[model samples]
Target: VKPLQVEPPEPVVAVALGASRQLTCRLACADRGASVQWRGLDTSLGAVQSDTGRSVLTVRNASLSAAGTRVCVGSCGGRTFQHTVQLLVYAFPNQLTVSPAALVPGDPEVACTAHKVTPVDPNALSFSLLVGGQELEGAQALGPEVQEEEEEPQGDEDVLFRVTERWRLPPLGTPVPPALYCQATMRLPGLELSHRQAIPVLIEGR
Candidate 1:
């Protein structure tokens, strides 16, 4: 079996909804008798082309189902070589939520929520809150709540989910930042994406 490799060999490849990227498969050692082909995701994938020693698959405007392991098999020198690449189809919108939050005085109950997000697979997203530049404990883990209008997507293009984390505090003395900390981090292998929202929570009549 001859050596075969995939370009952009970053293990895991992530493409946002309606984004595009290219993947190439080639023979690492020899290209003689090389016949490379792509498998998985059926025929609905992007355009694919086979050249002398390399095969390029154009992943463009991909949807949800387009995500997952992509297999490329190269038969070099009458032998077979294979490689699998992981694809992450995700939607984490950037709304620039640099605003303010509210921390009520009486029985201060503060909650931070991210609405209308995607990829809510169990343990896929993590939420946290920071107080006065310090990490707050107890991430009030609120499961992804199904949206009212979130009908099962026909094309699996979108899956709306809500992530909320809450922290209770006493109406006591403090030097919290004018804007509290709130963000959602989605940490999967090779997918290090997060969302930061700025919300100013003033001392309710200190």
Candidate 2:
């Protein structure tokens, strides 16, 4: 008779900041009480555990520095298996800001800007704007209203992210009961996506 084969679940990536959330680790092999220990990269983390027979480990609110390669060692019936896991923590959107806490229903125009701060590269990023959870249309390296001095503007390479952009809707034509809102998103490299920022504007005389 052939022995039954056991496979582990795929590893997943996690995002967190300072001590805010606990990283829960679960391991199941043959559904037996397996001794387990947690480690970071090659360094031992937590106490060398055995006998508990619990196949799970909890790491409370790991900070950025604590993020790295994690491994779980499990043993059952004299059989030992090691699993490697990777931990990562991403910072909050480094550069996204807006002006005008709230726009009046009849404001001539409003501007919103996103700045790339920290180690994040702004030039290579693509931005998405939104209002009231609904994304706004159109995009550019610069505001539509802003014109460069050079007649044939080649466009900015470093300032790929639009800064202090403005959008205007005349009140005369807009519905009296209008709402104002704004949002922003930065596209991450490797076709990934980052978190989004939402800001609301006040519309009066609705």
Candidate 3:
């Protein structure tokens, strides 16, 4: 007989105004046949069954009401595995925000600020700036597409890495303006990653 083991992905930081988000729960079970149930920590949140040995909890149009604790538990052959994920909702900056979020003409300097509630730092130092979000390639290449798998989480910290990224808007194609927005999200070592951010972009219109 062996004890059940669980491998939790590091926590991630998420930001959203009010959008649907999915939280994934992955596990490696000792027994192939296991019974799994996903809990929302809140008794109000409904229960969900695992799909093909995996569990996925989703928050439709994430809002204040959808914010709370989430848990995932599985049992197989007398062994059990469990995990938890927390959700936080943040409001997008009404007007454009800059680090320096201002756009200077002829200067071509751009800055953006992405904020998250929790933080995770192994060294309790460094920028702790994981890949906030980026453009995805393939069929959906129209604009900046949001992908949830790329965003990483931070441990329990109260630090904000104002990702002040600079951009250059061309005098030709679409335009690569300065912008900040929430995308992919994941958990870290000691921090519960959220899935939302107030992404602002700067563009020079004709």
Candidate 4:
């Protein structure tokens, strides 16, 4: 008889930050002598259930620190086989901030921030400040100044980031630049996420 086996739906499974998922391994054919087990990246992630030639593992509380590779091992007729799966965990919390709802000539500076985002690299987080869908100049430097961290340990769930930028408005001569929007986008190899917010502005009658 030919050695037969089957793989999971995909080699890589995706999960949102702070979420739960399950991985299963089973022998394709019914072989009473076969046994299966789960291993790698904290086998105790949650719970494991094994019966006959099948085994399932539940992974909970997913975070950037929880992303890793896993393996499923099975033995049949004294032969061993294994399957591999990669975990892709991501977060785009999109907690935006806006200041100075009242816009005036003396204080016409408007700012926005994209807070608590995760993408490994800061460049992956794109922060933009716009008015009525039009991007503004010098808007890239909207916030005070910040970074995920200078140099720190790996596998930290606390590893988060913030991006800020603002726009200094000029004296309005006519009716223009009506609405404002702040957007933050995150991009990765297998995932894309983004969040945006609108700042309330009240132009003082001149």
User: TM-score-based ranking, best first?
Assistant: 1, 4, 2, 3
Residue-wise lDDT of candidate 1 within 71-164, one digit each (tens)?
8887766777788888887776443232125543343556666665567654767666666556655435445443422354565445556545
Prediction-by-prediction clash tally: 4, 4, 31, 4
Backbone clash pairs in model 1 (N, Cα, C under 3 Å; residues 3+ apart or in different chains), count:
4
**Predicted model with the maximum lDDT:** 1
Task: Give each model's whole-structure lDDT.
Answer: 0.64, 0.46, 0.44, 0.63
Which residue runs does candidate 4 get wrong by more than 4 Å? 1-8, 42-51, 78-80, 99-111, 120-124, 133-159, 165-174, 188-192
Off by over 4 Å in 2: 1-10, 13-15, 19-34, 44-51, 91-96, 99-127, 131-133, 141-181, 184-206
TM-scores vs. true structure, each candidate: 0.75, 0.46, 0.40, 0.63
Error of 2 at 206 (Å): 20
lDDT of 2 at 62: 46
lDDT of 1 at 184: 76
lDDT of 3 by residue, 36-61 (tens): 67775546867876534666666676
Worst 10 residues of 4 by lDDT: 1-10
Residue-level lDDT tens digits of model 4 in 114-199: 66656535556666666667665544353444567435456654567665666666554346345567777777656667676776
